[PDB]
């Protein structure tokens, strides 16, 4: 779920 | 709300909290008792007495 | 090369009514265009399609 | 061969012999024979006659100048001589080494100095680091003031901050004039920073008048270019203590050393010419005949003579005969009327001897501004993050604050985080100013027989006024250090592998199980360990064999299988399980929090701010900005 407000995968950077 | 909801019956709490705040004793401006009261409250928190009191 | 599409049809329709004559040439850098600070200077410079317009190209 | 000329000092006969002596000092890749001359007085005819006779009867290739009592209108004659006879010269000292901007076209002067705008850049650099931004400009009626007034406005638009200018005044500060008008003009001003451009006599007159009209006390600050300040070895009266200037490298060398540097530059230029063509060009010194259209040979030699390096000191000359990219040094008047270095400048980054501008007084006891304080903290990943400044532009990325890990020499890191944002907002609302420095000793606090280390110690011994960061509240700390209201609530929590029903579970209450003995965390010398020991003796006894380096190695050990349970703070632990390799988890959750307390801003006892900044924290907590900070800095995936 790539939301527009803030995604934790997007807010906190990941590896993949 | 959380006491009565789990206490009596048939009532539910919606979601969770949104605006968080505490409870505290009230005293008149610059009264000479506040420091000792706070030192007692912190000691109570560290003992576990507010824990024993809480379950009760 | 040869170009065609949405904006080209718009350009033909635009040129018809106003009688100007176009000479279409593509971009050099290939970037849409931003503002950049060239090193050793604070005077900002426009890079990309926004520069080719501003200079006079 | 080379030439050397002196002027207007204590008669340097012994120095002349010392310069003449080393005909083969061997430190230069050449063996050009040195010689010397010397003029008794400085004048047009005298200088012309001596130089013309010398080079016309000596067949010299290069000549090095040495200045005098610091009178003006001397460099012009040398530029004239160079333009006529096509003989390159070089100045090293004194008033002749002041940049003559539009030099003659075909000449070669090569005077070592710094232009006015380049010399103003360092001033606007030192203004940036202390963030004064007052800009009260004063310039006398001098032939070069039109250039200074334009250069300041040019550099004003080549920097980030707005540089709010206040007032620019030109006043007749010559020998003869109406003192009353300038008295009235100077008495009517208000700005905490002044920048003035005058000459030495004009500087003395201006500073005497300013001292008369109350603008020299501990409140205001002055900055002057190197054209003023005179000798640099005889500061006169009425010069305010704290006067700042920027002089170039070699403001303390000897005359003989500077002549040696000049001969080294000439020798290196000639040698580098040989490595291309292989001969020193013949002289052209027909002073009486005055011949010469454009000459390509000497033109090539001069073009080759521009750039040069020497064991750390690089002397790269611009087309205009002033060197570019030097290592300027800032100087200031110490409290005993003696010039002293304050800040270096190498490759576009400024340094400072002090983290604050030390500010003096009439009786010379230094004072600290009321709206100022020193804040301490240290590293905790969710809340305080330290980053070295990037090699982009010297300064740190915006929305970050300069911070230093003290221990005299310093490296300026910058700090970013949660409590740092809180501090920025507090500085914006309570109208105060701060400097932030990290701690060296033990992380948070302890009492090894009254020797309190950490931020708590730094506050208790009156070396700081606050201590912000991951600092919990408990009874023993609040005895000696005050506290504000909490803004992030924590406690004790247990992290396990993705098995226990609380602290009072027999697995922790009874360390008498045979096959499996459970394992614990307890980063020592910390917040929780005190409570754990003082309330449970047996757990403390059995807890010696526990991993203890950081909140970093414990995660690895838990993921490996050398530990069975971790006990630590809540706000850091539950965040550490936010973005993890997979999903390791804790027990039931926020329902398992023990000794629920919060973080707090430590302060000195009976501090007038405490009440000032408790209300601001309550106001911030009220309207929900703290929740925005929480969702910006305290969010995870799992
Ligand atoms: C506060 O407590 C201290 C000891 O903790 C006691 O000495 C003092 O008298 C108390 N002050 C008041 C006003 O009760
Ligand atoms: C500049 O420095 C280079 C490097 O040694 C040298 O070869 C050259 O002659 C110098 N002068 C010019 C004009 O390039």
Distance of CA D180 to the CA centre of its chain: 40
Would you list the DSSP string of B23-44? ------TT-TTHHHHHHHHHHH
Residue D110: left (phi > 0), alpha (psi -120 to 50), or beta? left
Question: Would you give the end-to-end CA distance of chain B in angstroms?
Answer: 18
Please state whether beta strands D316-317 and D489-495 pair in parallel, antiparallel, or not at all (unpaired): unpaired
List ligand 2's pocket residues with C-beta within 6 A. Answer: D 272, 303-304, 306-307
Alpha-carbon distances, residue D227 vs D90, D95, D142, D203 (angstroms): 20, 9, 12, 10
Contact residues on chain D for A2, CB-CB shorter than 8 A: none
Distance of CA D605 to the CA centre of its chain: 33
Residue spans of beta strands (DSSP E) within D338-487: 339-344, 372-377, 384-387, 401-404, 412-417, 433-438, 466-467, 482-483
Among the atoms of ligand 2, which is closest to the Cα of residue D303?
13
Contact residues on chain D for B39, CB-CB shorter than 8 A: 475, 478-479
Q: Please list the residues that pair with C34 across neighbouring strands.
A: C47
CA-only gyration radius of chain C, Å: 15
Span from the CA of D291 to the centroid of ligand 2 (angstroms): 29
Most B CBs within 10 A among D473, D491, D595, hence the mutation to make, goes to D595
Question: Does the beta-carbon distance from A14 to D637 stay under 8 Å?
Answer: yes
Distance CA D214, CA D219 (A): 10
Question: Does an H or E element contain D309, and which?
Answer: strand D309-310
Size of interface A-D (CB pairs under 8 A): 16
Give me the phi and psi of D520, to 5 degrees please: -125, 175
Q: Specify whether the CB–CB gap between D65 and D74 falls below 8 A.
A: no
The dihedral sign for the CA sequence D580, D583, D588, D590:
positive
D551 CB-contact burial (10 Å; exposed 0-12 / middle 13-18 / buried 19+): middle
Tally of CB atoms within 10 A around D487: 18
Closest CA to D528 of D487, D492, D575, D582: D492
Local structure of D82: helix, strand or coil: helix
Q: What angle do CA D585, D588, D593 make, to 5 degrees?
A: 100
Instruction: Collect all residues from D whose CB is shorter than 8 A from any CB in C.
Output: 157-159
Neighbours of chain B (3+ CB pairs under 8 A): D
Distance CA D568, CA B34 (A): 30
Distance CA D596, CA B51 (A): 10
Q: Specify whether the CB–CB gap between D440 and D575 falls below 8 A.
A: no
Residue C15: left (phi > 0), alpha (psi -120 to 50), or beta? alpha
- For chain B, the residues before each gap (C–N > 2.5 Å) are none
Closest CA to D493 of D452, D537, D554, D443: D554
Resolution for this model in angstroms, one decimal place? 3.7
Closest CA to D416 of D444, D389, D452: D389
Question: Would you give the end-to-end CA distance of chain A in angstroms?
Answer: 15
Distance CA D120, CA C57 (A): 37
The contacts of residue D254 (CB under 8 Å, 6+ apart) are none
Instruction: List, as own/partner pairs, every contact residues D333-341 make where C-beta atoms lie below 8 angstroms and the sequence separation is at least 24, other chains included.
Output: D333/D235, D333/D239, D333/D240, D333/D241, D333/D242, D333/D243, D334/D241, D335/D241, D335/D360, D335/D364, D335/D366, D337/D235, D337/D239, D337/D241, D338/D235, D339/D232, D339/D235
Distance CA D507, CA D519 (A): 10
Question: Does the beta-carbon distance from D159 to C43 stay under 8 Å?
Answer: no
Q: In the block, which residue shows the tokens 């890191």?
A: D413
Q: Specify whether the CB–CB gap between D34 and D22 falls below 8 A.
A: yes
Under DSSP, the state recorded for D346 is: S
User: How far D162 CA lies from chain A's nearest CA (Å)?
Assistant: 33
Distance CA B12, CA B9 (A): 9
Q: In the block, which residue shows the tokens 């600092």?
A: D471
Q: Two tokens at D123?
A: 């001033």
Distance CA D600, CA D619 (A): 15
CA-only gyration radius of chain A, Å: 7
Distance CA D31, CA D568 (A): 75
Residue D523: left (phi > 0), alpha (psi -120 to 50), or beta? beta
Alpha-carbon distances, residue D374 vs B20, D96, D436 (angstroms): 31, 46, 6
Distance CA D523, CA D380 (A): 14
Structure determined via:
cryo-EM
Distance CA D256, CA D254 (A): 5
Q: What angle do CA D317, D318, D322 make, to 5 degrees?
A: 70
Ligand 1 pocket residue status of B36, Cβ below 6 Å: yes
Q: Specify whether the CB–CB gap between D124 and D159 falls below 8 A.
A: yes
Distance CA B29, CA D259 (A): 76
The contacts of residue D499 (CB under 8 Å, 6+ apart) are D587
The dihedral sign for the CA sequence C40, C45, C49, C54:
negative
Tally of CB atoms within 10 A around D34: 18
Span from the CA of B40 to the centroid of ligand 1 (angstroms): 11
Under DSSP, the state recorded for D448 is: B
Alpha-carbon distances, residue D66 vs C22, D254, D312, D323 (angstroms): 67, 12, 23, 17
Contact residues on chain D for C43, CB-CB shorter than 8 A: 158
Q: C–A contact (≥3 CB pairs within 8 Å)?
A: no
For residue B45, give the nearest of D597, D621, D624 by CB distance. Answer: D597
Q: How many H-runs (helices) and E-runs (strands) does chain A carry?
A: 1, 0
Distance CA D498, CA D586 (A): 8
Local structure of A7: helix, strand or coil: coil
Local structure of D79: helix, strand or coil: helix
Q: Specify whether the CB–CB gap between D620 and D441 falls below 8 A.
A: no
Q: Specify whether the CB–CB gap between D4 and D37 falls below 8 A.
A: yes
Q: Specify whether the CB–CB gap between D189 and D168 falls below 8 A.
A: no
Q: In the block, which residue shows the tokens 């991951």?
A: D470
Q: Specify whether the CB–CB gap between D298 and D107 falls below 8 A.
A: no
Closest CA to D425 of D487, D490, D354, D357: D487
Q: How many H-runs (helices) and E-runs (strands) does chain B carry?
A: 3, 0
Distance CA D249, CA D107 (A): 26
Q: What angle do CA D522, D526, D532 make, to 5 degrees?
A: 55
Q: Two tokens at D431?
A: 């109208």
Any CB–CB contact under 8 A between D578 and chain A? yes
User: How far D596 CA lies from chain B's nearest CA (Å)?
Assistant: 7
Local structure of D59: helix, strand or coil: coil
Distance CA C49, CA D560 (A): 55
Q: Please list the residues that pair with D64 across neighbouring strands.
A: D4, D90
Closest CA to D135 of D160, D167, D158: D167
Binding residues of D for L-glutamate, by number, are 470, 472, 477, 527-528, 569
Distance CA D356, CA C27 (A): 52
Size of interface B-D (CB pairs under 8 A): 25
Closest CA to D93 of D239, D224, D259, D214: D259
Q: Specify whether the CB–CB gap between D527 and D444 falls below 8 A.
A: yes
Q: Specify whether the CB–CB gap between D70 and D95 falls below 8 A.
A: yes
Q: Please list the residues that pair with D316 across neighbouring strands.
A: D324
Any CB–CB contact under 8 A between D636 and chain A? yes
Q: Please list the residues that pair with D137 across neighbouring strands.
A: D168, D195
- For chain C, the residues before each gap (C–N > 2.5 Å) are none
Under DSSP, the state recorded for D304 is: H
Name the residue with the closest Cα to ligand 2, atom 13. D304
Q: Specify whether the CB–CB gap between D469 and D383 falls below 8 A.
A: yes
Ligand nearest to the CA of D305: 2
Q: Specify whether the CB–CB gap between D525 and D446 falls below 8 A.
A: yes
Would you list the DSSP string of D121-153? HHHHHHHHHHT----EEEEES-TTHHHHHHHHH
The contacts of residue D366 (CB under 8 Å, 6+ apart) are D335, D358, D359, D360
Local structure of D380: helix, strand or coil: strand
Question: Does the beta-carbon distance from D637 to A6 stay under 8 Å?
Answer: no
The contacts of residue D337 (CB under 8 Å, 6+ apart) are D235, D239, D241
Give the per-residue SS3 of D574-632.
Answer: HHHCCCCCCCCCECCCCCCCEEEEEECCEECCCCHHHHHHHHHHHHHHHHCHHHHHHHH
Q: Please list the residues that pair with D402 across neighbouring strands.
A: D414
Mutate to test the pocket of ligand 1, among B28, B36, B39 (most ligand atoms within 8 A of CB): B36
Instruction: Quickly list H helices, D224-295.
Output: 255-274
Closest CA to D284 of D82, D85, D90: D85
Would you list the DSSP string of D465-520? SEE-SS-B--TTGGGTSEE---SSEEEEEEE-------TTSHHHH----SS-----
Closest CA to D82 of D65, D97, D102, D104: D104
């Amino acid at each position: 779920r790539i939301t527009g407000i803030n995604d934790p995968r997007l807010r906190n950077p990941s590896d993949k | 709300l959380e006491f009565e909801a789990s206490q009596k019956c048939d009532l539910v709490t919606t979601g969770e909290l949104f605006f968080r705040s505490g409870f505290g004793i009230g005293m008149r401006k610059d009264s000479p008792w506040k420091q000792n009261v706070s030192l007692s409250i912190l000691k109570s928190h560290e003992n576990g007495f507010m824990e024993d009191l809480d379950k009760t | 090369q040869c170009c065609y599409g949405f904006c080209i049809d718009l350009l033909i329709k635009l040129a018809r009514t106003m009688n100007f004559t176009y000479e279409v040439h593509l971009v050099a850098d290939g970037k849409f265009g931003t503002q950049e600070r060239v090193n050793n200077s604070n005077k900002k410079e426009w890079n990309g399609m926004m520069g080719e317009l501003l200079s006079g190209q | 061969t080379v030439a050397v000329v002196f002027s207007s000092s204590g008669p340097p006969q012994a120095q002349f012999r010392a310069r003449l002596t080393p005909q083969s000092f061997l430190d230069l890749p050449l063996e050009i024979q040195p010689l010397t001359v010397g003029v008794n007085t400085t004048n047009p005819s005298s200088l012309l006659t001596q130089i013309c006779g010398l080079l016309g009867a000596a067949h010299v290739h290069g000549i090095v100048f040495e200045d005098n009592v610091d009178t003006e209108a001397v460099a012009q004659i040398l530029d004239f001589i160079s333009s006529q006879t096509h003989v390159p010269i070089l100045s090293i000292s004194g008033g002749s080494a002041v940049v003559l901007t539009p030099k003659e076209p075909g000449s070669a002067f090569l005077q070592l100095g710094v232009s006015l705008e380049q010399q103003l850049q360092v001033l606007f650099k030192v203004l940036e680091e202390y963030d004064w931004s007052a800009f009260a400009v004063i310039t006398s009626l001098h032939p070069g003031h039109a250039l200074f007034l334009e250069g300041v406005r040019a550099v004003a638009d080549a920097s980030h901050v707005s540089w709010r200018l206040l007032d620019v005044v030109t006043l007749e500060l010559g020998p003869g004039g109406p003192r009353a008008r300038t008295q009235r003009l100077l008495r009517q001003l208000d700005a905490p920073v002044f920048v003035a451009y005058c000459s030495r006599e004009e500087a003395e007159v201006l500073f005497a008048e300013a001292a008369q009209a109350g603008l020299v006390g501990p409140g205001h600050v002055w900055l002057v270019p190197n054209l003023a300040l005179g000798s640099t070895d005889a500061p006169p009266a009425t010069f305010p203590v704290g006067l700042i200037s920027v002089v170039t490298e070699s403001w303390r060398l000897s005359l003989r050393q500077k002549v040696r540097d000049g001969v080294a530059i000439l020798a290196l230029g000639a040698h580098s010419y040989w490595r291309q063509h292989g001969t020193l060009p013949a002289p052209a010194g027909d002073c009486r005949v005055h011949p010469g259209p454009v000459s390509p040979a000497r033109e090539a030699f001069y073009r080759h003579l521009l750039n040069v390096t020497w064991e750390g000191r690089d002397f790269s000359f611009s087309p205009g005969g002033y060197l570019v990219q030097p290592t300027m040094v800032v100087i200031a008047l110490n409290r005993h009327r003696l010039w002293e270095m304050v800040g270096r400048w190498e490759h576009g980054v400024l340094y400072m001897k002090y983290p604050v501008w030390p500010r003096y007084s009439a009786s010379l006891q230094p004072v600290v501004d009321s709206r100022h304080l020193t804040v301490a903290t240290l590293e905790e990943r969710p809340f305080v993050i330290v980053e070295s400044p990037d090699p982009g532009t010297g300064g740190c990325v915006p929305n970050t604050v300069p911070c230093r890990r003290q221990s005299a020499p310093y490296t300026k890191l910058c700090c970013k985080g949660f409590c740092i944002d809180i501090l920025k907002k507090l500085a914006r609302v309570v109208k105060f100013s701060y400097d932030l420095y990290l701690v060296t000793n033990g992380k948070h606090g302890k009492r090894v027989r009254g020797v309190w280390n950490g931020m708590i110690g730094e506050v208790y011994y009156k070396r700081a006024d606050m201590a912000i960061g991951s600092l919990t509240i408990n009874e023993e700390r609040s005895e000696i250090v005050d506290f504000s209201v909490p803004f992030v609530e924590t406690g004790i929590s247990v992290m396990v592998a993705r098995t226990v029903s609380g602290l009072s579970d027999k697995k922790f209450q009874r360390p008498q199980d045979q096959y499996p003995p459970f394992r614990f965390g307890t980063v020592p010398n910390g917040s929780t360990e005190r409570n754990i020991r003082s309330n449970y003796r047996d757990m403390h006894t059995h807890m010696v064999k526990f991993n203890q380096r950081s909140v970093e190695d414990a995660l690895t050990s838990l993921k490996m299988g050398k530990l069975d349970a971790f006990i630590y703070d809540a706000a850091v632990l539950n965040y550490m399980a936010g973005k993890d390799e997979g999903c390791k988890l804790v027990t039931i959750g926020s329902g398992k929090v023990f000794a629920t307390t919060g973080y707090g801003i430590a302060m000195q006892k009976d501090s007038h701010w405490k009440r000032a900044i408790d209300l601001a924290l309550l106001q911030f907590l009220g309207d929900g900005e703290t929740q925005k900070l929480e969702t910006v800095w305290l969010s995870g995936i799992c």
